Symmetry: C3
Subunit: 148 residues, 3 copies
């Protein structure tokens, strides 16, 4: 399971839903995410968009980070201001998309990806300590310690 992922589709197999997460090319590092439903994000608006899928299984030692796509950012003057997917998350992935235009609305459409998902390697910390370091003497005082 070092390089495998399992996405969970929230809609029943007979029902119409979002296009599945897909990497555009063999060198694409992220899966393009698509909306389940259409909308127009008003100027200066912030939208929480359902993608139709969750992550059932993550690659070993990775989590999912939703980041913006260059096209959506540049062409539509947007950003994706958050996107950290915890490895115990059993829900549907939502894309949070901000419109930075004071005048133009952002069209959200079924066939156009709105953001992309990267499987980043992170450290799942096993031992943590909080210390106070005395700047004059160099003395270290352990405040708290915890083992996961």
């Amino acid at each position: 399971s070092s390089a495998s992922v399992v996405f969970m589709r929230f809609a029943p197999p007979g029902e119409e839903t979002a296009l599945p997460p897909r990497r555009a090319t063999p060198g694409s590092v992220a899966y393009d995410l698509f909306p389940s439903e259409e909308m127009d994000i008003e100027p200066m608006g912030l939208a929480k968009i359902s993608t139709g899928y969750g992550i059932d299984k993550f690659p070993d030692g990775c989590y999912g980070q939703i980041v913006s796509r260059s096209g959506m950012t540049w062409k539509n003057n947007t950003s994706v201001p958050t996107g950290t997917i915890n490895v115990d998350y059993r829900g549907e992935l939502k894309v949070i998309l901000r419109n930075h235009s004071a005048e133009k609305s952002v069209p959200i459409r079924k066939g156009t990806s709105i953001a992309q998902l990267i499987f980043l390697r992170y450290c799942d910390v096993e031992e943590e300590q909080i210390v106070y370091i005395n700047e004059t003497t160099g003395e270290r005082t352990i405040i708290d310690s915890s083992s996961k």
Copy 2:
């Protein structure tokens, strides 16, 4: 001690400070960060908020990236527009939080977390080259090459301006 972290609290053990960085659940990838000071971020404002802690020791091969939390982003219409913590940083972690509301202020309160810190794996590059590639012929020219210093040579340091 490859999957271990040490946070340094800047306030002496007898003084009131921020709640320590803490992961909310066993599957939470990031440590929730708390403020050591209170304020109200004006509409369209940007704040640099002290957390009360630094990182004394990072997990092997990782650095710290401060990123936004979904709740703070969505409920308070904010973003965390920067957050790269270098592995030689000995200072206090500060959260840079932007308010995107044109009308409402964002309340920053002790005990309410404002961002989260992830220990991401990165490549500490040891060898680098700069090349020029001719688009018509395909010929390559090496412009520069550098190997990251590894305490082989020492020299007296000289003051700047």
Copy 3:
């Protein structure tokens, strides 16, 4: 071997200062502009850096992120920055000005963003399931 090595490609013949880490503990390469401009209030700029990535370190891709100073001092953000490992073009920094009144001066001597080589998983096996019914399965 190529586990901790990078090759940058300069587009100008033997226009911008090269990507450079400020200190031994700096995790990212500061990127510099190959052109000057003033980003109008609430503007969004796509700034050329003068360099591409010819070779990435093994198992890494390039992520362009904001620098703290540029963000705080100039009220900016870097709202996108994912560099695919098959990208043969010049790196562009997308920089947003969040000020309603002040412009952001972009000048060749000042770094505008920074590039981190992050470790990621290049997925080899993927499945779509309905919760279990396998909907689709694909091997890269």
